[PDB]
Amino acid sequence: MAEVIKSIMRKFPLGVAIVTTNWKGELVGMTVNTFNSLSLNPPLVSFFADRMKGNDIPYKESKYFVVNFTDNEELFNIFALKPVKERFREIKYKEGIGGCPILYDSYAYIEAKLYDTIDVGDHSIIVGEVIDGYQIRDNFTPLVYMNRKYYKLS
Amino acid sequence: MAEVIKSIMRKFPLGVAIVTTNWKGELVGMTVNTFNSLSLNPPLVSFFADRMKGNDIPYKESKYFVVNFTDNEELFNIFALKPVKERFREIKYKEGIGGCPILYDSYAYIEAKLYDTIDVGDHSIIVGEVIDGYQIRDNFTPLVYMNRKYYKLS
Numbered sequence: 461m462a463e464v465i466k467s468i469m470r471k472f473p474l475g476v477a478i479v480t481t482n483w484k485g486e487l488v489g490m491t492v493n494t495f496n497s498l499s500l501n502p503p504l505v506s507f508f509a510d511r512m513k514g515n516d517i518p519y520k521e522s523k524y525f526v527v528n529f530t531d532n533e534e535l536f537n538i539f540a541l542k543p544v545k546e547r548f549r550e551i552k553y554k555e556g557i558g559g560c561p562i563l564y565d566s567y568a569y570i571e572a573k574l575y576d577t578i579d580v581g582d583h584s585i586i587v588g589e590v591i592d593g594y595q596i597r598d599n600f601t602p603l604v605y606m607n608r609k610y611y612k613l614s
Numbered sequence: 615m616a617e618v619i620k621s622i623m624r625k626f627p628l629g630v631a632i633v634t635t636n637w638k639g640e641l642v643g644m645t646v647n648t649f650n651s652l653s654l655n656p657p658l659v660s661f662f663a664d665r666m667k668g669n670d671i672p673y674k675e676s677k678y679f680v681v682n683f684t685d686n687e688e689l690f691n692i693f694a695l696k697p698v699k700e701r702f703r704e705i706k707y708k709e710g711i712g713g714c715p716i717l718y719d720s721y722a723y724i725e726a727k728l729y730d731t732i733d734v735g736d737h738s739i740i741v742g743e744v745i746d747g748y749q750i751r752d753n754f755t756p757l758v759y760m761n762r763k764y765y766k767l768s
């Protein structure tokens with residue numbers, strides 16, 4: 461079989477973010493490399509959630525979600541590798557719209573309201589309608605994921 | 615109005631590619647920063663097409679499309695800025711699946727078959743089923759778009 465299709469994606473640089481929500485009282489988040497702007501009028505953003513792993517379910521059952529933009533590699537690792545029950549013990553967060561956690565170490569975030577979801581193959585596209593966003597820290601180092609690694613920008 | 619939501623995206627680094635198709639004999643392509651992997655089984659890839667500009671129509675009416683991965687900044691500018699009738703005069707290309715053009719200066723490409731399209735707000739999500747991909751050049755410099763500019767990776 462051609463699994464050259466995975467090898468090409470591993471060399472394709474992608475921006476990363478951490479999406480959180482409050483899921484019936486349970487604080488959850490995850491590192492994503494599928495976040496993007498989908499539409500400007502109306503202002504929709506989206507990301508892709510893995511259905512096999514059940515990453516889609518939390519966001520399908522909540523009304524809001526926050527996109528956290530940060531430059532601390534360690535946080536990306538926490539929200540990809542640590543057990544789900546341990547994630548919010550180790551970091552500083554404040555509560556935001558609908559109880560959703562905003563990471564303290566974010567340089568920016570966007571709060572959004574779930575707008576639609578769409579199952580395509582083994583992922584769902586989760587679309588949210590933007591309702592606010594703030595730039596908090598002005599001086600930061602944006603990161604990209606490529607080949608299991610995070611790179612600063614040249 | 616909050617157009618802080620545009621200012622946040624301008625600081626968010628994104629991978630770029632050029633998607634082409636053969637549209638009823640007309641060779642068309644465009645620079646996109648919305649290309650990503652959507653699903654592994656089945657292997658689907660996608661990008662977002664601006665409906666206001668009519669970028670969606672070519673891909674909705676063709677059976678295939680090619681994703682071209684390249685490290686030549688000049689090509690990204692050609693396939694974003696030059697009039698549509700002038701694009702394929704200025705560069706070297708070969709014909710591929712379904713007549714779709716493959717750019718000669720690509721280090722990799724993926725050929726794909728249209729699988730579905732979905733209108734959300736002012737964009738459509740164009741999903742294609744991967745049918746091949748090849749890594750051609752081994753030594754390249756992947757680029758990311760941020761703030762109207764292209765950066766090498768540090």
Ligand SMILES: Cc1cc2nc3c(=O)[nH]c(=O)nc-3n(C[C@H](O)[C@H](O)[C@H](O)COP(=O)(O)O)c2cc1C
Pocket residue numbers: 476489490491492493494495507508509510513515516539540541542544605
């Ligand atoms: C950089 C990186 C990118 C990721 N992107 C996504 C993604 O966009 N969508 C997704 O569902 N999971 C993605 N994941 C996996 C989730 O982070 C992970 O499945 C989620 O945190 C739940 O954790 P668990 O599988 O360990 O329970 C990514 C992981 C890493 C390392």
Ligand SMILES: Cc1cc2nc3c(=O)[nH]c(=O)nc-3n(C[C@H](O)[C@H](O)[C@H](O)COP(=O)(O)O)c2cc1C
Pocket residue numbers: 630643644645646647648649661662663664667669670693694695696698759
């Ligand atoms: C880096 C960059 C990213 C772009 N990404 C997209 C995109 O993902 N989807 C889209 O429809 N147009 C995108 N465009 C615009 C298209 O390249 C452009 O509209 C297309 O080439 C048709 O050209 P025209 O509007 O000049 O006729 C992007 C442009 C640039 C500069």
